[PDB]
From a paper:
The eukaryotic La protein recognizes the 3′ poly(U) sequences of nascent RNA polymerase III transcripts to assist folding and maturation. Human La (hLa) is a 408 amino acid monomeric modular protein containing three structured domains: a La motif and two RNA recognition motifs (RRMs 1 and 2); these are followed by a largely unstructured C-terminal tail that possesses a short basic motif (SBM) and a nuclear localization signal (NLS). The LaNTD contains the La motif and RRM1, the domains required for high-affinity binding of 3′ oligo(U) RNA (Kenan, 1995; Goodier et al., 1997; Jacks et al., 2003; Alfano et al., 2004); indeed, it has been shown that the two domains must act synergistically to bind 3′ oligo(U) tails (Goodier et al., 1997; Ohndorf et al., 2001; Alfano et al., 2004; Dong et al., 2004). We have solved the crystal structures of four LaNTD:RNA complexes, each containing a different single-stranded RNA oligomer, and compared them to the structure of a previously published LaNTD:RNA complex containing partially duplex RNA.
To try to address this issue, we cocrystallized LaNTD with AUAUUUU to obtain a complex with an RNA having four uridylates at the 3′ end in the same C2 space group as the complex with AUAAUUU RNA which only has three 3′ uridylates. We found that the two heptameric RNA oligomers bind with essentially identical conformations. Thus, although AUAUUUU has four 3′ uridylates, it still adopts the tight turn observed for AUAAUUU so that U−3 is stacked on U−1. This finding suggests that the packing environment can have a considerable influence on the bound conformation. In spite of the variations associated with different packing environments, it is important to emphasize that for RNA sequences terminating in four uridylates, two distinct modes of RNA binding to LaNTD are possible, involving either U−1/U−3 or U−1/U−4 stacking interactions.
Author numbering: 6 to 192
Write the structure that this text describes.
RNA sequence: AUAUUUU
């Protein structure tokens, strides 16, 4: 049972580390604004408004507990424990031609998921194919899931491996997997 | 409707 508490805390850490991570932060208008207010610090009162974290827990003490154990050590907790921020010692990487070129080469296109599949279904299916840093579910202008996604792996090596494996299926349904740039070339 | 939500 104590195991479940560890699991919840590992998920809380992962979710918050995603919001403040290299992939999401540079594209997060709302969050980039909060960060400019009090030297990076964002009150837990605000953090609780984040749906995904909300679903995990809205309790400040749990969140702080979870973060204080994080292995990533990306986040910093204030003394009064009412706010958190990305460590000033882990600044965002400079987005150079090279950085972007590397990102594109680590991005994959996958088609074949059912329209009702959720980010959680997809995340679970992916925890066995390499370290994923971002999952983008492709939706219509009105937010309807198209069944296709873009995935960004931790490195071009893990992405290459994944794209190389031919017999992949989701809940025993065939899947079309290509490198993201290759997908655009065809389309 | 910045009432932005993997905010």
């Amino acid at each position: 049972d104590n195991e479940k508490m560890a699991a919840l805390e590992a998920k809380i850490c992962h979710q918050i580390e995603y919001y403040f991570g290299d992939f999401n932060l540079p594209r997060d208008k709302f969050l980039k604004e909060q960060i400019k207010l009090d030297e990076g610090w964002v009150p837990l009162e605000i953090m609780i408004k984040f749906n995904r974290l909300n679903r995990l827990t809205t309790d400040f003490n749990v969140i702080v507990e979870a973060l204080s154990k994080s292995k990533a050590e990306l986040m910093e907790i204030s003394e009064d424990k009412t706010k958190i921020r990305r460590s000033p010692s882990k600044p965002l990487p400079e987005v150079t031609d090279e950085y972007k070129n590397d990102v594109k080469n680590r991005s994959v296109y996958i088609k074949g998921f059912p329209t009702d599949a959720t980010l959680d279904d997809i995340k679970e299916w992916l925890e066995d194919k390499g370290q994923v840093l971002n999952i983008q579910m492709r939706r219509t202008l009105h937010k309807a899931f198209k069944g296709s996604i873009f995935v960004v792996f931790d490195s071009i090596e893990s992405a290459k491996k994944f794209v190389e494996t031919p017999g992949q299926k989701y809940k025993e349904t065939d899947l079309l997997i290509l490198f993201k740039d290759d997908y655009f070339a065809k389309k």
